[PDB]
Amino acid sequence: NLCPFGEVFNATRFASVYAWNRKRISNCVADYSVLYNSASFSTFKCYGVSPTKLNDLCFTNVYADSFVIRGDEVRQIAPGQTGKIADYNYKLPDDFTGCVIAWNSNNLDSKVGGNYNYLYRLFRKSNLKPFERDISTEIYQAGSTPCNGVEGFNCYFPLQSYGFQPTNGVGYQPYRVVVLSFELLHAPATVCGPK
């Protein structure tokens, strides 16, 4: 058995940031070479582990979290970074021992009018805990007037849409990001590399 990394990477439709997709890779053999030998990715940063020293390493569970962001926000997919995405959409723990792999997807995730299918959260009362997913649609409130289900004065819909048009700059061009997290618990080690 070979770990279905291509199922996560070479996928037709990716998920939005407020609803990143976590796939549990387990009970297979994983050749990470196919990832660190491919130049298709613009951001390949591995924190805590060396990409080369993984095909000889063994783990119990790997987690591939996929989501589509904009370029000038990919930097927030890293430990100890803060903005809109890291604070309200996807936060990686400061003690992160994993990998972040991001490439450009303007040719697949951008429409003439705009790929409004991708969303991102703009408002949240609390900053997101590490590895949190807020799929809520409840209205925000920034005053003393309870909204009770209305978008207006100090009351806003939490989610906004990405205006992904092909002519947009490289900073606003859609980038697909996959975060590979690694786990060791006291259980049968399932994800073992070629060795």
Binding site: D72, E73, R75, G169
Partner: protein
């Protein structure tokens, strides 16, 4: 210890021009060079890393390239806010060594200074030492002549001048001349004037007061 040599040391251009700052290395830093913008009174803010990659929040005019011993930094359309000192740092061999710097100053159309003369405060006068101040608010070029005249006497000595840096929105300098006089010597005279000579001023401008 790899020694980084920055060239030039001071560069002047206009709003919309391009600017090139080069960094040289003692050894071969394999793309291990980053750039930092230090504005007057702030901390070095990183703009480019990996010689080419740009940090988030850095404008498009900023760009960088280079390899081995020659590295380059380029501002395509220099805007007034980009007035700062730029440094290059290696990360091939510890310790990380920086460059000497490059003060990129902008060129502005000639602007006349606004002159204001502030007399000393009565509190300072009670303190035993008074200070008269002259102010030049918005002028380019930086060259200006401030002359104190006390009772129509062209006084030179007790004056002390301080010039701000180029404004990040108007590229305009500002000057302050502080004449310090003892309370007894200040009360001997009456007319206290500050005369300003500048390029934009076709004739010297004198702002006066009387105690």
């Amino acid at each position: 210890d790899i020694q980084m040599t920055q060239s030039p040391s001071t560069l002047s251009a206009s709003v919309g021009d391009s600017v090139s700052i080069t960094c040289r290395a003692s050894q071969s830093i394999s793309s291990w060079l980053a750039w930092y913008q230090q504005k007057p009174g702030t901390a070095p803010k990183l703009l480019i890393y990996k010689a080419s990659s740009l940090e988030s929040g850095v404008p498009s005019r900023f760009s960088g390239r280079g390899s081995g011993t020659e590295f380059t930094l380029t501002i395509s359309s220099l805007q007034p806010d980009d007035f700062a000192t730029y440094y290059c740092q290696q990360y091939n061999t510890y310790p990380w060594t920086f460059g000497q710097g490059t003060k990129v100053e902008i060129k502005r159309t000639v602007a006349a200074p606004s002159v204001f003369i502030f007399p000393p405060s009565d509190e300072q006068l009670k303190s035993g030492t008074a200070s008269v101040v002259c102010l030049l608010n918005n002028f380019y070029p930086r060259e200006a002549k401030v002359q104190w005249k006390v009772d129509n006497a062209l006084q030179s000595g007790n004056s002390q001048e301080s010039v701000t840096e180029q404004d990040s929105k108007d590229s305009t300098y500002s000057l302050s001349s502080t004449l310090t006089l003892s309370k007894a010597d200040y009360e001997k005279h009456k007319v206290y004037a500050c005369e300003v000579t500048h390029q934009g001023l076709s004739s010297p401008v004198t702002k006066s007061f009387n105690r």
